[PDB]
Amino acid sequence: KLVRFLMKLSHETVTIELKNGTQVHGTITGVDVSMNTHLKAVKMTLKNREPVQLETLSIRGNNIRYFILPDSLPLDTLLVDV
């Protein structure tokens, strides 16, 4: 059911920390049921390396540590599950 929360984040800009310490910053185009996350206008910084720019990026759900959500995100609204 929480993946359903992530699926409502289309068009939101997030920072995602991956299991390997990589940090991905971009705009969510979609999240699927397996948590695979698709983004555009991406800036990705591997742990201790230079940031690279990507037009599009898809992340395997099992590679995600956490999402840093937009401060302004209305959680209470998004968490209503009907």
């Binding site: 929480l2 929360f5 099992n62 995600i64 840093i68 959680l75 968490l79």
Partner: protein, 100 residues
Amino acid sequence: PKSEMTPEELQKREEEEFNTGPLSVLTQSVKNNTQVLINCRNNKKLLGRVKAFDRHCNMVLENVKEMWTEVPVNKDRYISKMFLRGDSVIVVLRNPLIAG
């Protein structure tokens, strides 16, 4: 104790499970607006309040302080809103005493 029940009883069951099972820790955070200390898999610890969680320990957290050490200095980050993937959790400790 049944493989398939009514959709009303099936939410009730999951709610019984969250109350009496190992995940009651998370239930207590949501219910009492208390903080949990999570020993995250990335070595680091996360201190914050559980806004929502599922059977897999995926969580929506607010006012998270991420804390770690490296070479011997203590480090931290504040994250106002986070979605934590369940399998990144090692242990969860409720009511952790801190400064005052």
